[PDB]
Paper text:
Myelin protein 2 (P2) is a myelin-specific protein of the nervous system, which acts as a peripheral membrane protein within the myelin sheath. P2 belongs to the fatty acid binding protein (FABP) family, and it is likely to function in lipid transport during myelination. P2 has a role in maintaining lipid homeostasis in the developing nervous system. Mutations in the gene encoding P2 are linked to Charcot–Marie–Tooth disease.
The human P2 structure was refined at 0.72-Å resolution, using data collected from perdeuterated P2 (d-P2), and a number of intriguing details concerning protein structure were revealed. Based on CD spectra, the folding of the perdeuterated human P2 was practically identical to the hydrogenated protein. Upon crystallization experiments for neutron diffraction, large d-P2 crystals were also tested on synchrotron X-ray beamlines and observed to give sub-atomic resolution diffraction patterns. The overall structure was very similar to our earlier structure of the hydrogenated protein, but the space group was different. The packing in the new space group has, in fact, caused some disorder despite the high resolution of X-ray diffraction. This disorder is found inside the β barrel, around the bound fatty acid. In the ligand-binding cavity, the new crystal form had more disorder than observed in the previous 0.93 Å structure, and hence, less hydrogen atoms were observable, e.g., within the water-mediated hydrogen-bonding network. It is possible that deuteration weakens the interactions between the protein and the ligand/water molecules in the cavity, such that they become more dynamic. In the 0.72 Å d-P2 structure, the guanidinium group of Arg126 is a geometrical outlier, standing out at >8 σ deviation in the MolProbity analysis. Here, human P2 crystallized in deuterated form, in a D2O-based buffer, providing a new space group diffracting even better than the one optimized for h-P2.
Residue numbers in the entry: -1 to 131
The structure:
Amino acid sequence: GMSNKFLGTWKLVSSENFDDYMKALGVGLATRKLGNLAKPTVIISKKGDIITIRTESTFKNTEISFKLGQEFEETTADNRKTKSIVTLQRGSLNQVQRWDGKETTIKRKLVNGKMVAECKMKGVVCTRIYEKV
Ligand SMILES: CCCCCC/C=C\CCCCCCCCCC(=O)O
């Protein structure tokens, strides 16, 4: 199952190419400016077979809960209404969002004690590094 080492509170410390990823998602400039500057936390918790991922910024939060393998509805931080699914593959949490005939992936893995999120939209890739608080 998901490693217990995912559980807890993670703080963003570095990011690369997030602006273009947000462009590719259709996010407008004003919102991209906040996404490029903010350093969110990501809180991962689990109760039974339900994993919860809560993202906190001072001006925008989000939260998803899911069971591995099972599709769920998600309203994203940029206000997309998606059908999403998270699977566990080779120790990574692999989240796919689908909306409007579009698709994006957000893979979260543990590497050297950090959480690495890799995001892909139509070949535009970004990486975000999180440390464990
Ligand atoms: C929720 C707190 C940050 C919100 C500020 C920016 C608003 C919208 C940008 C939309 C980006 C959607 C991707 C969010 C990041 C997914 C990968 C990650 O968790 O690091």
